[PDB]
Structures are given as structure tokens and as C-alpha cells.
Subunit: 278 residues, 3 copies
Amino acid sequence: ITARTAPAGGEVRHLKMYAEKLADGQMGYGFEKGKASVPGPLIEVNEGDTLHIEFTNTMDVRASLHVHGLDYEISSDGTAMNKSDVEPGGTRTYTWRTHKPGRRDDGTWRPGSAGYWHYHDHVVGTEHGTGGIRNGLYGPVIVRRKGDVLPDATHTIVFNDMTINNRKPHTGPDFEATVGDRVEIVMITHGEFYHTFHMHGHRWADNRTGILTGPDDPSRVIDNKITGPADSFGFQIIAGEGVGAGAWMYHCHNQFHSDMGMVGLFLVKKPDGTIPGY
Amino acid sequence: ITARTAPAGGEVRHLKMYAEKLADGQMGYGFEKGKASVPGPLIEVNEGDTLHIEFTNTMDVRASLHVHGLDYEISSDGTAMNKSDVEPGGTRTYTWRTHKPGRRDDGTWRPGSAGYWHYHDHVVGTEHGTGGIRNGLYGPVIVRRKGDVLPDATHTIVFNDMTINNRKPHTGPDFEATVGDRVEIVMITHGEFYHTFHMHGHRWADNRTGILTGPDDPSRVIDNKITGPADSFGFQIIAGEGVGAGAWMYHCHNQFHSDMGMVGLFLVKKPDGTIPGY
Amino acid sequence: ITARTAPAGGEVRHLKMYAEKLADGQMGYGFEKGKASVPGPLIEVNEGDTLHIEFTNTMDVRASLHVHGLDYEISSDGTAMNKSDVEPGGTRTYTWRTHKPGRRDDGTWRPGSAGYWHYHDHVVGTEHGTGGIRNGLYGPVIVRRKGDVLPDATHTIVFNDMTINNRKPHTGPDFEATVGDRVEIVMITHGEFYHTFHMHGHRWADNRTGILTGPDDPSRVIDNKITGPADSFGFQIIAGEGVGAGAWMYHCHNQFHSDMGMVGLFLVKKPDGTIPGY
Ligand SMILES: [Cu+2]
Ligand SMILES: [Cu+2]
Ligand SMILES: [Cu+2]
Ligand SMILES: [Cu+2]
Ligand SMILES: [Cu+2]
Ligand SMILES: [Cu+2]
Ligand SMILES: [Cu+2]
Ligand SMILES: [Cu+2]
Ligand SMILES: [Cu+2]
Ligand SMILES: [Cu+2]
Ligand SMILES: [Cu+2]
Ligand SMILES: [Cu+2]
Ligand SMILES: [O-]
Ligand SMILES: [O-]
Ligand SMILES: [O-]
């Protein structure tokens, strides 16, 4: 493999995180005060890493951090129930652990933590984070397995109710690649709606990594994936592979949601920077 | 594998079953008159087993027994259309067969019956069982393949419209386990709604058994599964594996649905019997 | 395998196609003028084939042809944005290529084009084809991989909003087979609703072909499949295998949708042409 690959994990990483109310009314996570995003920052790690996150709630209401997929103790589940949220102005340290797969004492196979996951608030608005999530308190988490192929860039598309990334309808987000790039997309759904994520000109494997191991990988290949609230998948694609440059559309294929604004562009450029038709 | 495993099938099993109207308005299946449950009793069998069920309808309206997954002749499909429902007070013997996998004469591969299946009414309220299903006429069916790992206990979570197991909003069901137990979940959806089943602190394989065969199983690992009417999956988890004891929440992650009551507790206890925080 | 298998692709195929406004008000694709259908004709090809489709728009409104899964350049994505639709009375040649799977230069594994795909309009009603798709501008596309088992017949079932193949509620379509026939279903969903496709007495593998490769194929076996707008899968079944002849119901298991009309019959006949109960 001429491509970069993920190393074996086992680091103890540290991370400061904030929750901020944004001037537009939204709420967002950030790694630096004043630099909060919706979606929030991407956290990326290797199976075996441990992550300590000193999370500071800079808001006037309680807020929390809840993650999918990773190992955490109940003290870190981010729920009011388990006394795990954070009061206004407070600071709590959360810990996420990840393990490699392997055989258990009983001969059964323990799955690893690798995958395309995500984190979100669990206590704003309701004890399930309905307000925090609607407001933008969600972000992606990637856990890589030793050997995983690494992309040239990672992009996060979140269908949150009937928006992408909390944007006004019909305003993207667009993003750009050059024909040939190894583009990784993290796709997360939130809210009370169901969607189908469709991408013109490109397809991927409906498995953990979006990539087939080889000739024996039985995973289906698809260009259209159904998604429900708190579902998260990812894939990698070769921008324009076999199809060339262009303004490639991505959208929710729900005809109503398409019409109502859930559309963006994957702008795959030629080596000279141009996009056929423009 | 030092865990118990399912034996080869081939038995001819007999079963008596009833449909009763319950004092609280609902309708339920049972194995003994006066002991009907919503969800109904679990039927569990091995590939190759045959099941003769003498089903007696103790209600004042036609009722039936329709099963997913297993082999049955049209006389046992449980529809009014094919004359295989049951008159009030009547008694009828349904037969379900199961088979092992193996090679067909044409060299193709016939799948076996193994899986996480279910049974429900088909003629109450409408010719599609809408009333019976609404009222509680559904139950789980497990078909095991020789060698399948057996659990310490099995639990059935049914998302029926916007309830769990037909319970009142925000009333569980909760279950208890001890850190270390092998806990099997049978998850069934019924009605006119779509859901995502989420479970804190735990994850499983999105394949037939919920378990990875080993290092080569390409099955994706998830903690959030989308489900539609009459969908049915299952899985096993090691209670608290890598995360400890606690009041672990499970719910539909549809923000509206969890707000409206669709939440339960998976109480994983320390060996002293306690649950962190209480 | 003593059943017919798909050959290696590589042909350059040519195809003429029309969009016709039908007298009942719908819009359909056809291969011959005056012989348009909803669903439109089945296009079927082998990995490596190229297909040039001279598509003539016979209607009073712009219309287009957009395909899932296969390779196409941006000049052929069928969108207004990319100047790829067809004006009334106009004629445009779209091109679809397909490729075999194989190893990329970087050691990674490029998936082939094989699958159960589909094509539909992208510019009638809205820039997402909401009108065309509503009216019936959709059809199936199969891309076979060398060695794929071929069926005795293929049938296409489209859940379009709350109809099957744009039919009036409770009017089928029905299909006939003989016990033993190898029957292929192409299942496609369009519109703004979500569905579960259920079939009595039969089951299939939730992978690309609906078939297990053999004893090592980890794919789940199911009889009930969730589906969203622009989703497309297919499978093969042996009509009546292990269950006998009969009037086998297929429907959307959404209790509301089946009550509301989304039901059809798979009439599996005895060798004497009869159907148990009639
Ligand atoms: Cu939660
Ligand atoms: Cu959508
Ligand atoms: Cu498309
Ligand atoms: Cu969540
Ligand atoms: Cu049915
Ligand atoms: Cu729900
Ligand atoms: Cu969670
Ligand atoms: Cu059913
Ligand atoms: Cu599109
Ligand atoms: Cu439906
Ligand atoms: Cu059924
Ligand atoms: Cu489409
Ligand atoms: O599309
Ligand atoms: O959650
Ligand atoms: O059914």
C-alpha cells in the first residue's frame, strides 16, 4: 500500500473543550474559547488511545458531552441522571477509552472501538439534549484501527432535522477537491427526521470504513444510505474516480427535503483548478 | 469457545398457545391460559427443529399467528386471505419448520433459518393485524445455529409505535444485570413509525448474531440501529464490559420519541449488587 | 454451479429511449415511442460494458435521465445545474460506463459497478425531479458481475410515495411463478416516505445480490427490509422453496401503508398451475 496508514494506538491524549453560546443563538463546541464550530471540532484517535477531555461549560445553562462507540465509565456518560453534566461556568473532565479487538478468555471475539462516531450534548433543552443538539452541540469522532488508510482531507456532513450542518436551506455546505484526492466524509444524522444521503458520481462500501478489504469483502456498494437520528457512518472516495471533474451534487434524496434545501456541492476540480461548466 | 453453544437441531417440538383479551384492554399471547404477556412468550428453537403450535383463540374476534423467517406452508401464514386465521373460541394447529444451510443441487447456497425473528397477529383490526399488533399481539422467536453462543439471559425490547413493550411513556422497561453477564437483546419494531435503537456504554455487530466471527468478520460495529415496522434484530453484550457498572440508558434516539417517553434503563450492578450513584 | 451465470462485460451497447406524457397524466420512459411504462424498461449490463443512450424528450417540459451507481461524466448527470437535461422535443445522448473491481495503484481495492441500481428524472417539477418521479419517470438498472447467477425472470417493485409502481391502492401488482422458479426482485423506493418491504414465506440475504456466497458469507438473512427515497436493492428467491405453493403476500409492513393499499401477491403455482385455496 502506497497510501498512509493509521499507526497502532496506545497514547494518552489530553484535550481542552468548551461549549459557547454563539452570537446567532446557536451553541457550539470548540477547542479554543471564541473558536467554536457547528459541527464542533473533529476528534480523531487510534484504538488503544485514551482521551481526557477537560470540558468547560461557558454557557448560562447546564450542558454535557456524550459520545458514541467509545468506552466510558458511567461518570462520563454525560447525563443528568448520572450526575455527569456540567453546570454553567463549570469544568468537568471526561475520559474516553478505546480498545483493540481480540479474543476473550471464553474464546469469543471482542470488537474493537474503531469506527465513525460522534459526540453531542445530553442535557440542554431536555434530558436527551434535544435543545443542545438542535442548537449545534454535535461533532464527529473517528477511531482508527492500525492499518486504516488515511485520507487527504476529512469533511463532516450532519443532517440535523432538515438542515446540513445547521445551515439555512440551500446554502451548501459546498467543499472542494481535485480529481484524484482521497476524500473522507463523516456523515451524522440528528433530530427527529429520517434521511437518505446520496452523492452523484461516487459510491462507497456500506461497511465500517466505506472501503472493501479486497475481492472477498462481501459488503454491498451503494451511493444512497438511509440514516436515522444519531446514526453515524463514514467513507472515503477518490474524487472524480472514473467520472472526472465537475460540480457533483450531494443531498438527502427525500424529494421533500431536497426541495426544501438539503443540498450541497462536491466541487471536484481539474488539475488547472477548473470545474466543467464554469 | 468456553461458553455454552447451541446444539444441532432436528427435534419435533409441540406448543400450546392462546390469545387472550387482557383486563386492561390489550391483547396478549401466552402458553398457559391466564398467563399472557405483552410481549408474548419467547419461542426458541434450533435449525432443523419443527414446531407444531396448537393455537387457541379465546377472544370474541378473529385472531391469527403470523411468523417471520421460519418455513411455513400457506395454510399457516396466518392470513384471512388464505383462510388460516382462527374464529372466536376456535383452535388451530400452526406448523413452523426450520432448516440448516447447505448447497442446493444447482450449486447455489441455501440460507438456513437461523436468526432473530418474531410472530404477531394478522387479522385483528384489519387484514394486516393493525389492531392485534397495536393491542400487544407480538412476540419474539429465536432460531439458533449449531455453535451459536448461548446467553445468560434474553430480553425483548419492542418499539411498538411510540411505546416500548406497550408500556406507558417513561416507564421502562428496566432490566438488571451484573457486570460480566452475557446479555442477549431481541429488538423488534411494530407499527407505523421509524426508530433508532441506542444503548449507552455498549455496542454490538450489525450482523445476524450481534457478534463478530473473529478477525475477519467485516461486519460493522454500531451502537445505534435504525428500525422500521416488523424489523427484528438481536445481539449479545457483556454487561459493563470495558465501562463498568451503572444505570445505562437505552432509548430510541429520535429526539422527539425519547422526549415523549421511549427510554429504559439497563441497570448493570457491581458484584455487591449496587449501581454507581445510588 | 449448474445454473446460468453472467458473462464478463466489455461490450459497447446502444439504446434509444423516450420520455412520454401518458394519457392518464403520468410520465413514463420507453424504448419505443408509444410503449412507455411505469416502471420504465429494465436496463441490464455487465461490469465493463459501456452504454450510450440516445434519449428523446417527447414532452412539453424539460426532462432528464439520472442514473445511480454507474460511472458517468458530469455532462451526463442529468441535472439542470450541469446543463444535462433535455428541452421539449429535444434529444441528447447520455453515456454510462461500468468497471470491474480491481486493485488500485496505491494497493487499495476499487469496487466494481455491479449492483441493483436505478434511473429517474431530475428536472420535472423541481431541480430534483420531484415531479418526474411522482409521475413515473423511474426504472431499474442491473449491473451483473461475471459469475452472478441469472434468474428465470426479473420483477421490479417500486414503492413510490404510498404506491407500488404508481398503481391505485390495493391493486397489486401481482406476479406469478411456479414452485421452483428462480425469481429476481428489484426493489426501489422513491418519494418522501420510508418503508419496510416484507414478503411472506420467503427470505433473502441483505447483501449485494441477495445470495450467500456460501458457508462463510456473514450477511444476515432477512424477510423485511427498511428503505428510503432512492434506495435500491435486489435479491433472488426460489419460488416456494421449503414452503410450497400459494398466494404469498408482499407488502410494506408499515401498518398504516399496508392498510392504506401497499399490498401485492406473489402467486406461486403448483406444477398443475393451481394456487392452494383457489
Ligand atoms: Cu442518550
Ligand atoms: Cu432528509
Ligand atoms: Cu444521483
Ligand atoms: Cu447520542
Ligand atoms: Cu403480512
Ligand atoms: Cu423512535
Ligand atoms: Cu449514547
Ligand atoms: Cu409481519
Ligand atoms: Cu440528485
Ligand atoms: Cu410503506
Ligand atoms: Cu408477513
Ligand atoms: Cu436519484
Ligand atoms: O439524484
Ligand atoms: O445518546
Ligand atoms: O405481515
